[PDB]
Amino acid sequence: GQLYMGQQGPVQSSRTTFGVNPDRQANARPVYLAPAAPMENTYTYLGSIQFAAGRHIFGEPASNVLPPQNIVPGVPTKHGEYVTTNTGDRLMASSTTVTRDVSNGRTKVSIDIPYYDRNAVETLKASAIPGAVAPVGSFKVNVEVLGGGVLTGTDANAQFALDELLSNMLMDAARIAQDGPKNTARLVAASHGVMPQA
Amino acid sequence: SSRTTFGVNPDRQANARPVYLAPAAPMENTYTYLGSIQFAAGRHIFGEPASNVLPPQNIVPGVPTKHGEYVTTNTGDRLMASSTTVTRDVSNGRTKVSIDIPYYDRNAVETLKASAIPGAVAPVGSFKVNVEVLGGGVLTGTDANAQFALDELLSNMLMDAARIAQDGPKNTARLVAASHGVMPQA
Amino acid sequence: GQLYMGQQGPVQSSRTTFGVNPDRQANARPVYLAPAAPMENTYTYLGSIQFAAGRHIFGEPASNVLPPQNIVPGVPTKHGEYVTTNTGDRLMASSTTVTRDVSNGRTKVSIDIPYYDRNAVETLKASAIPGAVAPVGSFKVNVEVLGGGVLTGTDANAQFALDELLSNMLMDAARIAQDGPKNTARLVAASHGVMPQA
């Protein structure tokens, strides 16, 4: 490679793999599985807008905090679900689901909430029809933490520090995801991004 | 594969960075001077542009291009409309702006005017000026903020180069029909 | 050879003979030659056991300190002998000898003392026979100092320090030679060594 001046004389710079231990520690670490899933932020906002945005009408949950669906204390699982059942006036009750998959150092949490056709629901109310409406679609939010491949000398204590580091990256990621003025479009029906000049 | 390096690491950053493209080309300096000399020097007569700022001809907003042109039309008495062109090429970290303005034969133009005869005249030649910035080879460590700093560094070298090119008394020959360069004594 | 990390980069370890001066100084050094040989330790012990151990009867020396036999002051020799003559009751007198050889940096001192057949001597005394007994065998002890090949920069003064170093190794060697309890066999008629477990 390039040439520089060492005390022996002019010496060639060199790039070597000598002295780098890339060995990894196996993803064999049991992790804490919450006994319920708190959806407080989303449901307080849904109470704020009165469970209706435009033509999307939403169901009222059973609880702001979701109970486990297929998780039992003391039984290890790689897939766990929490669920409640949204209900509403002239709405067929429909479940809202929070899924957690923990495999090979990869943790992934997904949230799926359904909605209904407000045009149909208000037609039902206004002309005094006796039927109900089934869900029309959903919205989904996924979050993923790739925490595999810790190094071999990673202390049992230092894995907790790494835990907190990843959780702070999580917070930063969601903030960057929703960052922006609420005067302007930023999430739904997205086509492309346009950052403003000033 | 991760390797520890002793000495210089020459890894360069790939030339894969979009750059800002002006929505129009301002030519204010040259056209104000052309108005100053009444669009005529010696036997060279020039045409009057439609605008001092040239609109894009083949550039569409939001569409990346590696070659773009701004253009206007010079018109004149007893003259055939001739376009003045500003070309910008961006490729592989090298960005180059060229300016081409045509001229006409003043003897033909004023002979027609003085003879009151139907002829009109086309351009005889042009003058061209090129400017080139070789910005490739950014090192690996450089982040975006540092790249902005390098942007401004190159633009300052640009200004220095133009000043060094035009440097000299206006009493004396310095650009056109150049044969060689000579330095004065004391 | 093996690989290690030097400031130039990964560097191969190397073993060279560069910068080692093994030149030696010739063994051309006159040494002191004692004017007599003191055998005080052995002869005081021989007085202790009354010049008799088992069937080995020993002669009584002329002197505890032996005079030179072929050494003359101011004459350089590479071989010198000291001697006295043991005598005894009904014993034909017999010489005890101490030999010193000094050649080419190697000093060697040997001691040879004879003994007689006590069975024969006490037969003579007991049945009142008029004859005498001649020596029957001997015991010998050798000591050797290989002090050749001093280095070239060895100062004349430092050769005295080396002298004393070798003499201290001598003392340590004799102590290791006779080391051991006197309850147990350690020197004569030796067949092999057996160091005790505890």
Question: How much is the radius of gyration of chain A in Å?
Answer: 25 Å
Give the biggest sheet of chain A: 6 strands, antiparallel
Q: What letter string, H or E per element, gives the SSE order of chain A?
A: EEEEEHEEEEEEHEEH
Beta percentage of chain A is 25-35%
Terminal CA distance of chain A reads 45 Å
**Assembly level:** part of a larger assembly
Number of strands of chain A: 13
Helical proportion of chain A, percent range: 10-25%
The chain pair with the largest interface is: A-B, 14 and 10 residues
> What structural class do helix, strand and pairing data of chain A support?
alpha+beta
Task: Output the number of helix runs of chain A.
Answer: 3
What coarse outline of chain A follows from CA principal-axis ratios? elongated
Describe this structure in words.
It is classed as virus like particle. The entry lists the keywords virus, virus-like particle, structural protein, virus like particle. Virus-like particle of Beihai levi-like virus 14. Chains A, B, C are coat protein. This is part of a larger assembly, with three copies of chain A. In chain A, strands 6, 7, 9, 10, 11 and 12 form a six-stranded antiparallel sheet that branches. In chain A, strands 1-2 form a two-stranded antiparallel ribbon. Chain A has a two-stranded antiparallel ribbon with strand order 4-13. By secondary structure, the first copy, chain A, is α+β, with helices and mostly antiparallel strands. In chain A, 10% of the residues are buried. The first copy, chain A, starts with a strand and ends in a 20-residue tail after the last helix. The first copy, chain A, has three helices and 13 strands. Helix content of chain A is 20%, strand content 34%. Strand 3 of chain A pairs antiparallel with strand 1 (4-6) of chain B, so a sheet runs across the interface.
